[PDB]
Symmetry: D2
Subunit: 215 residues, 4 copies
């Protein structure tokens, strides 16, 4: 079907953090059935980001998650038409990021229309002082609410010299058409920046995901 | 000085809710020393707005707040330079609105560069189905944190049919230069849409703010 | 009926980070003046290992001056009285929740208080007792599901300037049907007038007035 | 040390929206298997007018199967033991907080538990007893200021399908110095196996295993 073993990705992100705009474009590819992907990103406007790049990574498609036969894959059923999602990223120190990504599909390439905004970050925080090393792996909880799919997950950014920085994720998925809604379930995630340049004008990012249930 | 009894307003807001972009430019004027301001907003893009126009209103200048003599005025002190603020708006039903405003000054007219974003608003919540009536008067609490000025406030939208809809504001004001930093204090608020057509493409908005110390 | 001058008796039972304590108290106040004072004594778990400041706002909106044009849910609930529950969330993850059941005996209000708070950071302002006082406040009260709710942005100034934020969420419940009021505010002002070295004894005061929009 | 088969003995004293209650419990489990079961008997405040489920995750991470590659904060903390504190924030505003002090007598863990919850809507799932059970979950544990933290996105599926979200914030404090683990997870699956009409009697089971994630 539309969901081929191998696929491409085309995306652009426009946003602002603490009132300073920026834009990013990216090209990538993944295997929707293996739940793996990869993508190169470049800062098109507003470089060099004066904040931790990590806050952005998870915004850069649940379609790339390995769903077992026993669990309805809300996300793949949504295509060709596609789906969009809304996300809340509440940081333990007050910082807050809002994001949106509209997902379309051009032939064999997913196209993302991404918005991203973040405010109230302390200048002395791990975010504005770029003290983030990476996001820890996670297990997202997803459940139906009002005919759509909700996804929540407790995230953590290990900092330099140890210690963690928590953020609570609150994502909402909305399919453009009617699809089989699934039962409560989870999706383990692992996102890492493989490489990047001095100021992150160029970044290589990878994500791995697989869904499952209780135990 | 720099700020005068009567000054004008020019604003351009660009933003999105639930993923739907829109643009609104506004115009208006007010009395900075009397805490009063009026403005007529107009939806230039994304109309008709699919959500309650009330969640935008507080985003459309603390300069407009009557300040007592015994309390430092962090706002009037920032110009000619000016200041910028970031706000977090958290609604009781998961809805979260984020916004920023960069206020500069052209002669006797303030210019705003606003950005507004809100997500996760329940499809059947009060906001998306536009069942709100307006904001109740309020009292903001301003305090200093890391050399800047914070300001929090418990906000409530009166819903049609009575009952309210709570939201919490968390604002951070940043003067574009070094200015005196006030002790703890409050700002009484009261905003209202005075008029507007059926889907709020055109809106007349008013506000009156008055800062004071604690009750004695 | 609520007279111009009233007395107060009370006992609190609670814990902070799992460590138990108990405090009893006596006082008086002027319901219509919105003023009151009291002397509290630590009975168990003393000397207290956390800032007393977190307990004060638990130690009765009856003691708020209410203007004629605003329904006074509180002064009405008596002689039956009312009860309340409150969530107190501090920015650093410290969370306390309390309840108070207020009854009336002659001219003396009787309080049965429960206080519990957890996850206070070992080196935070609370456990390190680095708080100075609560700043005055303005509580927002609105009817919800047939009962009255009060929310307020609170803040403690810590030693050497600086503030520590906490959000209050209170639910008040009349013991018998009373008239529900419209949306209104209550300006508060709570202060510890005196205390001995370890706070085993404390004299507390509060002043408050209800009002509507600016 | 900690044996392959151990016993449990506990007592919970608490309140919900101002109404006290107490529940005694006895049980056992396989600590290396992450399996445990117990029988709960209400001793006060019965019949409980609120969803029993809000209380279940309060009724010992020792009962979780830790692989060899992860430090076991809980098992190394004996026989001194440890205590924990927890915030449970529900989406409709209800808030619960608890603390458990855990000691060891031979082969029987001994829990002294406290439980408090406020602001639960009268018409909400909890007060209307509209809950079915907690959904399985994965707890995230990381170190903070010398102790262990564990947060989880919980969810009660309600009658009529649909879920009620609750955010857990737990802090684990070993009664002695023990090695601190790196970031990790603990899947959980808790459930009531049997109960009587007013839940005065309840059999509870829990299954848990620790892991490092993909």
């Amino acid at each position: 079907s539309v969901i081929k073993p191998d696929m491409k990705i085309k995306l652009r992100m426009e946003g602002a953090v603490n009132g300073h705009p920026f834009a990013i474009e990216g090209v990538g590819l993944g295997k929707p059935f293996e739940g793996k992907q990869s993508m190169d990103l470049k800062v098109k406007e507003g470089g060099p980001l004066p904040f931790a790049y990590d806050i952005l990574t998870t915004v850069f498609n649940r379609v790339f998650a390995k769903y077992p036969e026993n669990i309805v894959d809300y996300f793949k059923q949504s295509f060709p038409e596609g789906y969009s999602w809304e996300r809340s990223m509440n940081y333990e120190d007050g910082g807050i990021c809002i994001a949106t990504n509209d997902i379309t599909l051009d032939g064999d390439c997913f196209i993302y229309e991404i918005r991203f905004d973040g405010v109230n970050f302390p200048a002395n925080g791990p975010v504005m002082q770029k003290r983030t090393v990476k996001w820890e792996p996670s297990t997202e909880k997803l459940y139906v609410r009002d005919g759509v799919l909700k996804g929540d997950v407790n995230m953590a950014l290990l900092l330099e010299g140890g210690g963690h920085y928590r953020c609570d994720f609150k994502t909402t998925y909305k399919a453009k058409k009617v699809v089989q809604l699934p039962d409560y379930h989870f999706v383990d995630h692992r996102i890492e920046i493989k490489s990047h340049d001095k100021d992150y004008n160029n970044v290589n990012l990878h994500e791995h995901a697989e869904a499952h249930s209780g135990l």
